[PDB]
Amino acid sequence: TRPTVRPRNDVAHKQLSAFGEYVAEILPKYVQQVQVSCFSELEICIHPDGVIPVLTFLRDHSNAQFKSLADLTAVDIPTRQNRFEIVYNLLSLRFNSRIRVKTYTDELTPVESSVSVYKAANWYEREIWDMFGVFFANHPDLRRILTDYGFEGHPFRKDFPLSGYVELRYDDEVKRVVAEPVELAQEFRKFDLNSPWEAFPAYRQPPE
Amino acid sequence: REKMFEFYERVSGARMHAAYVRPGGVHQDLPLGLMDDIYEFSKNFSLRIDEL
Amino acid sequence: LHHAVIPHGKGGRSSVSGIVATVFGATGFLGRYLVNHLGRMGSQVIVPYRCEPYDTMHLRPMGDLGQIIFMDWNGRDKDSIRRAVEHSNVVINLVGREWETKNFDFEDVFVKIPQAIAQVSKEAGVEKFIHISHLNADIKSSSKYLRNKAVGEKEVRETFPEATIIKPADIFGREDRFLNYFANIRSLGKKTVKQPVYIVDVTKGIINAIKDPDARGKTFAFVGPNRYLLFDLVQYVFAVAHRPWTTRDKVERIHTTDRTLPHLPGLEDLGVQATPLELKAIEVLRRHRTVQPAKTV
Amino acid sequence: TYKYVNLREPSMDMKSVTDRAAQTLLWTELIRGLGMTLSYLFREPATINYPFEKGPLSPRFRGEHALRRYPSGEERCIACKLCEAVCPAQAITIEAEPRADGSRRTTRYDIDMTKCIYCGFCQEACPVDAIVEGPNFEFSTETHEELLYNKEKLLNNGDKWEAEIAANIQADYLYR
Amino acid sequence: PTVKPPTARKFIWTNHKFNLSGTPQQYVPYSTTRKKIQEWVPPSTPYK
Amino acid sequence: VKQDMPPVGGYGPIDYKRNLPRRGLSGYSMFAVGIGALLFGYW
Amino acid sequence: ASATRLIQGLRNWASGRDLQAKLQLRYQEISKRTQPPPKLPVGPSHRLSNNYYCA
Amino acid sequence: TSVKPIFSRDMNEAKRRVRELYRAWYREVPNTVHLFQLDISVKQGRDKVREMFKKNAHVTDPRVVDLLVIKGKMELEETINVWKQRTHVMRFFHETEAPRPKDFLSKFYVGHDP
Amino acid sequence: TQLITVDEKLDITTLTGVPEEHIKTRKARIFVPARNNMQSGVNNTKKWKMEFDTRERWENPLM
Amino acid sequence: VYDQVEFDVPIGSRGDCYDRYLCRVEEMRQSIRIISQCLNKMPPGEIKVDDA
Amino acid sequence: SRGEYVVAKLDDLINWARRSSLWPMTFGLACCAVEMMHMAAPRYDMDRFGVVFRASPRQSDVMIVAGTLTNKMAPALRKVYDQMPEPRYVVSMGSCANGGGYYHYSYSVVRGCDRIVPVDIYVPGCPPTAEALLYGILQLQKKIKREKRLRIWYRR
Amino acid sequence: GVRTSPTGEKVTHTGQVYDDEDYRRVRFVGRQKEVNENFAIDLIAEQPVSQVGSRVISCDGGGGALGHPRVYINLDKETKTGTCGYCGLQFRQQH
């Protein structure tokens, strides 16, 4: 398994497991799950009410010092009743490490904003509200950031179609750019590329 | 910059959007005589930075 | 009915409407509005143009890919007309000039060209022919314009009994020569009575006359909902525009009252609601800026 | 492992002070910039005389698409639809049926040159080297509809550019 | 090609043509497939 | 096998440092030149 | 490289550097545009024995 | 069944927020008409505002109508400042859109759409 | 109490931005997809899928 | 293989635009250094992973 | 006759003046603007054809749309196009401006800039090379050369 | 081997031609319809059959790596030749 297989890191896996135990034991009020992946990445899944305390602890603790917020993302998984999974990626320059903090919310429940901890969260969760419709309570200035000014609907949700519901064209009668119901000269062709055979037995789900 | 674009086009066939680095390595091997041109360009680039 | 001409879609830009229209004089003003209305339904439009293609550049984005076909034509050449109309099923005639020039007088523009177009479209088997006349057209009129238009209308009717003849009264819009004429003259007031009609209503009437199978052989008179005297019309135009090219034939046509023809069907019989001038006067004359409505008789 | 850009303290003796003040009063570095731009005036410019001189290219260059043939007149495409499956922009439409002698040939092969991103995935997914990206790049059109190629246009492009496409393939096929 | 001439093939054009955009010889797109659905032609005789 | 490779002895030197010539006279010399030009003009 | 010696001297004086040593315009020093054909090596899995994919 | 509120605990404060948003839109409609040089009157703009509020008037969940008030507030702020152009303001009025038939017979005539 | 009581049915149609005629005139279908008879694998019949009815497709006049 | 090449990292001192411009110029120089090192240490072998 | 000869020579004069002093404005939207900048480089030298570098929108002749025209950008593009003095020309650069390109089926991309403005020359590529945009500019010059405005005016 | 129509329109190698009453012939008015004059079905018919002395044959299209994937053709039937599925070349056993 030498030339064509990715070498495995075990010291980092042990250190990340120990730090996951450390965090999940310091904060039992919000932490629900702690896992470490195959490629040595630590994910801490927490309750949505403890977004501010967990992030402030990870930012300010002497043994954490996660001073950088790299990326803030939402993921749309429609089969869950809390379909939106909000993911914080943090970087610690003191210990040269990275962590992942995950929480959940649905369409109608707001999430506490983390601008008071990290200042990149302003534009990041403004984009999250724009694309997934997740409201962030106690935000300084929450509006749209990437979509059109009159756009209706959140495009990164999975029930939103690839091509939207409206399209723009210039009309000479009103001398203006107008929005009309979408009609495609060629329909986007859907491809069924999924193999009917199981690829990875290690990820096999148990039957009902 | 045009010279470096020539390097990109010689290795991939496109000046800007090479689509060269792919998961698993690179799509095509370097053609013969490319690294000599890279060496000459990098030899003169010090004077180019100095003049800027 | 061919398989490629059966309508499909939802009436959008990419749809198929089944209307193959050859619009003569589509580079003007009414033709521009008509091509815009035809192209948004997804119709095949053939535009025979006389001028530089730089003028047809504005007509180019009015339809989908392959939906507008530009071709060169000559007024006195029947071969170009046969080249243009032999594949369509409706031919619209909008050729006109407000003045006569060295190469084309009013008899060439209003009599010979419509007669040639109608004869060729009859010989090419075109189902629908629509020809745009004038409302005040009369054989005894003092203006050469209206006399020649009446003669051309009679000739078109006699050479194409299924032709639809349309008599618009006076058309105002963004690029017209009626409200823009009064606003730019900075010519007088008399006992003349007029009922101008909006351009969009005329375009909708033309489209509905294309669509309606019972409009063949009829003669419609498109007039507006309100009749105005000339003097208070000019005063209203000057008051809206915040203002405190011509010929003698235009002077005679301005001082000619708009006749009343209750026998002829109008816009209300094609399902078109006429737009009054008060709603669109600000839109037309906002460009001239740097109001009490007019009195209707 | 790191270096300190802009951490040079200025000397405070009379020599350095008078040098800096003379540079201020007499504008020395401005003369330096003027003189070097003057030196750059007297060089031969790098401008080539288009269209009489063309910029250098490589046998891997990706330009206009073409459909090739075997060296017997028979076309190479056998309607396997790999190029339209791998196309990242969905620019290829293929429809196939068995022809008169039972061969597996396309009846429709459209490439939308306004959708295509000129990525070369189709010419490397082809098992028979049928579709290629030729070396031609000067094919600007005055109309949108002229950029919607059918099978006949691509076959004509192949017949037009075979004498160069075959040479480029012969030069490059050992790197694949 | 005065030194290394290209391979001669019978289908290769003997006459090179430049860019014909804006000319009467310009390329016009069309569908190369035939009709899919065949219609029912009614009989030309009366039912009597 | 034939491949695009560096030579056995490698390539030649390639500079990567800043190079500024530091040409011209001193402050005293240029001030003396200017004062001498002024004196000649006044004379 | 076609410049005269006087223009070369003025160019080098005004630039402050020997411009002829490092010319930005390429000449016959670069590699040829026609190369002999290559022979690329194979990877470590190109073996006839002890090459089971499950390993 | 207990859920976390957004702004309104029950329906009364939500109705107050709806009332305030309608008052703000009704006040701003003349300035929006004047500043954007629209071709409509003030009455048509106020009728459009009332039409949107009436279209959106069948909801009984306090959190849903809180989000609706929030999105309306964003639209109002987007219009008070000149961020929308004339096209974004006029996109509420579908002038170029063809009239969609509603009865069964015309839909039967024009296509297969139910 | 930071937790309010809502006894109404969950409905979010006023927030999704979908036009109403793509809500009231569409029929969603919830089903486990059939195994392709050309293959013996059963990995594609594990998950439920929801899709929609097929509308009109026509032919482009140009291509 | 960025751990097998030797280069320096420019570090500013005042946080202004001038220090960032100097950092970009020095990063150009260090890129030239890494380019020379990559030219002198190119190994033979294949270009894609052999997992077909 | 004499008049046709006079208007033909005058048409040649005005077409030579217009086609040899094309002042472009460039919409720096996306990748294709970087390739436009590379055509303005010393190697290809757009200036030597009489085609200046980055002229004002209020005095330009040809407008180049180099990049993707999104839904948020289209009214601004139309507003800039409407303010240009005639004779005005539009060149579409790259697939994004030609027909949408990679992002054709996106929810926020206009499928071609010809849905907003009339387009004269379509330059294909992604990105089209500096050679290709230079060829498109020279083809636009050829199109301007064979204009017949004064002959059309005389014949009408 | 091109063919014309009563309209006067050329017929492509796929058999496509616009109908006489079809309105889509207007796109070729003032322009031309592009067809390929080299019909591959007629061109592959001129290739002589290759006679070999084996029970099976192998075809790669000529050029090795520049052809199609190598296939094997059986020549047991005497009533018909063995056509390659890729290149269309046919083979016949000598006996």
Ligand SMILES: NC(=O)C1=CN([C@@H]2O[C@H](COP(=O)(O)OP(=O)(O)OC[C@H]3O[C@@H](n4cnc5c(N)ncnc54)[C@H](OP(=O)(O)O)[C@@H]3O)[C@@H](O)[C@H]2O)C=CC1
């Ligand atoms: N108020 C009005 O405008 C009314 C108009 N009408 C009728 O409606 C029609 C269109 O009117 P309108 O748009 O205002 O007028 P325009 O002058 O704007 O348009 C007339 C069109 O006819 C073309 N044309 C004119 N003379 C000739 C010729 N000798 N040979 C070929 N083409 C020619 C012009 O082409 P090009 O510009 O390329 O030369 C132009 O496209 C006319 O028939 C007019 O009589 C009727 C009632 C009221």
Ligand code: SF4
């Ligand atoms: S080059 Fe890429 S985008 Fe273009 S047709 Fe081929 S696969 Fe599609």
Ligand code: SF4
């Ligand atoms: S990949 Fe090649 S053989 Fe397959 S359909 Fe495309 S062009 Fe034809």
Ligand code: SF4
């Ligand atoms: S056409 Fe290609 S290169 Fe040009 S802007 Fe679009 S993605 Fe970028």
Ligand SMILES: [Zn+2]
């Ligand atoms: Zn074969």
